[PDB]
Amino acid sequence: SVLQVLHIPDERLRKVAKPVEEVNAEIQRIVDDMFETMYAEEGIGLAATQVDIHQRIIVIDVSENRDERLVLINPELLEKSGETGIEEGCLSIPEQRALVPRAEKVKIRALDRDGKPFELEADGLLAICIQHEMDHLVGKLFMDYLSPLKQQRIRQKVEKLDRL
Ligand SMILES: CC(C)C[C@@H](C(=O)N[C@H](C(=O)N(C)C)C(C)(C)C)[C@H](O)C(=O)NO
Ligand code: NI
């Protein structure tokens, strides 16, 4: 259940995810496929948008052993504070890294894999991860934070690679 991960310039990466209607068996099977897809490569997070599923679903696992499954369905940002920035790589942006500004601390409301509501306060990489994947669900990639010139450099470099 390693799903095809979309790579730029793909237009489908800029689509906005719908709210999940009900967390039923079908949603959980998407969730479970997202984990396996995420686990097949380096990475700590994945938004449904990235596998062409346009529903507000995010999976995260930051553990070394890949045994700490976090599920965010219909996430809502409640609060944020501070600023930070790391060189983010994105599965959907082949072989590019770039620093992007983020809140340092976030608080979010979401539904878990059972459809049960919860709240989560995050900082460090987890805060960054969460915002990065929530960006994906509104068709926003980390490159959008960069200058038009740098954005065009990334786009040139990929038209070179996807060609070969
Ligand atoms: C930037 C990360 C919060 C999310 C991405 C991610 O894990 N990349 C790594 C990363 O840059 N660090 C800082 C861990 C990676 C490039 C090292 C795999 C993820 O692969 C994605 O694109 N999810 O939509
Ligand atoms: Ni990404």
PDB file of C-alpha atoms in Angstrom, residues 9-62:
ATOM      1  CA  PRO A   9       5.180  20.363 -11.444  1.00  0.00           C
ATOM      2  CA  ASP A  10       2.026  18.260 -10.868  1.00  0.00           C
ATOM      3  CA  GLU A  11      -1.088  20.487 -10.655  1.00  0.00           C
ATOM      4  CA  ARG A  12      -2.788  18.031  -8.304  1.00  0.00           C
ATOM      5  CA  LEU A  13      -0.354  19.074  -5.567  1.00  0.00           C
ATOM      6  CA  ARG A  14      -2.028  22.514  -5.554  1.00  0.00           C
ATOM      7  CA  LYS A  15      -5.524  21.120  -4.971  1.00  0.00           C
ATOM      8  CA  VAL A  16      -7.252  21.877  -1.652  1.00  0.00           C
ATOM      9  CA  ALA A  17      -8.397  18.991   0.548  1.00  0.00           C
ATOM     10  CA  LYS A  18     -12.048  18.570   1.572  1.00  0.00           C
ATOM     11  CA  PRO A  19     -13.011  17.978   5.192  1.00  0.00           C
ATOM     12  CA  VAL A  20     -13.385  14.288   6.033  1.00  0.00           C
ATOM     13  CA  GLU A  21     -17.087  13.516   6.357  1.00  0.00           C
ATOM     14  CA  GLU A  22     -16.891  10.521   8.717  1.00  0.00           C
ATOM     15  CA  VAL A  23     -13.965   8.443   9.877  1.00  0.00           C
ATOM     16  CA  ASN A  24     -15.076   5.091   8.520  1.00  0.00           C
ATOM     17  CA  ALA A  25     -13.232   1.935   7.433  1.00  0.00           C
ATOM     18  CA  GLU A  26     -12.378   3.490   4.041  1.00  0.00           C
ATOM     19  CA  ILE A  27     -10.700   6.523   5.722  1.00  0.00           C
ATOM     20  CA  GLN A  28      -8.657   4.192   7.979  1.00  0.00           C
ATOM     21  CA  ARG A  29      -7.484   2.221   4.940  1.00  0.00           C
ATOM     22  CA  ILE A  30      -6.285   5.523   3.410  1.00  0.00           C
ATOM     23  CA  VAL A  31      -4.606   6.336   6.733  1.00  0.00           C
ATOM     24  CA  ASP A  32      -2.931   2.934   6.798  1.00  0.00           C
ATOM     25  CA  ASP A  33      -1.770   3.224   3.187  1.00  0.00           C
ATOM     26  CA  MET A  34      -0.313   6.708   4.017  1.00  0.00           C
ATOM     27  CA  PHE A  35       1.809   5.262   6.824  1.00  0.00           C
ATOM     28  CA  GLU A  36       3.192   2.501   4.605  1.00  0.00           C
ATOM     29  CA  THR A  37       3.823   5.020   1.830  1.00  0.00           C
ATOM     30  CA  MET A  38       5.558   7.311   4.346  1.00  0.00           C
ATOM     31  CA  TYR A  39       7.583   4.403   5.762  1.00  0.00           C
ATOM     32  CA  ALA A  40       8.958   3.452   2.338  1.00  0.00           C
ATOM     33  CA  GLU A  41      11.250   6.494   2.161  1.00  0.00           C
ATOM     34  CA  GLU A  42      12.958   8.989   4.468  1.00  0.00           C
ATOM     35  CA  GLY A  43      10.361  11.320   5.948  1.00  0.00           C
ATOM     36  CA  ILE A  44       8.379  12.000   9.111  1.00  0.00           C
ATOM     37  CA  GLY A  45       5.054  13.155   7.701  1.00  0.00           C
ATOM     38  CA  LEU A  46       2.647  12.940   4.830  1.00  0.00           C
ATOM     39  CA  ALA A  47      -0.505  14.762   3.741  1.00  0.00           C
ATOM     40  CA  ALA A  48      -3.216  13.021   1.759  1.00  0.00           C
ATOM     41  CA  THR A  49      -2.820  15.659  -0.978  1.00  0.00           C
ATOM     42  CA  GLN A  50       0.632  14.243  -1.714  1.00  0.00           C
ATOM     43  CA  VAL A  51      -0.875  10.863  -2.724  1.00  0.00           C
ATOM     44  CA  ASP A  52      -3.718  12.455  -4.729  1.00  0.00           C
ATOM     45  CA  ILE A  53      -6.312  11.974  -1.975  1.00  0.00           C
ATOM     46  CA  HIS A  54      -7.964  15.331  -1.499  1.00  0.00           C
ATOM     47  CA  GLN A  55      -9.269  14.994   2.016  1.00  0.00           C
ATOM     48  CA  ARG A  56      -7.909  16.588   5.185  1.00  0.00           C
ATOM     49  CA  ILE A  57      -5.776  13.682   6.416  1.00  0.00           C
ATOM     50  CA  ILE A  58      -2.229  13.734   7.730  1.00  0.00           C
ATOM     51  CA  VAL A  59      -0.017  10.987   9.068  1.00  0.00           C
ATOM     52  CA  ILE A  60       3.125  11.574  11.116  1.00  0.00           C
ATOM     53  CA  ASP A  61       5.741   9.286  12.600  1.00  0.00           C
ATOM     54  CA  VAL A  62       8.944  10.916  13.901  1.00  0.00           C
TER      55      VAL A  62
END
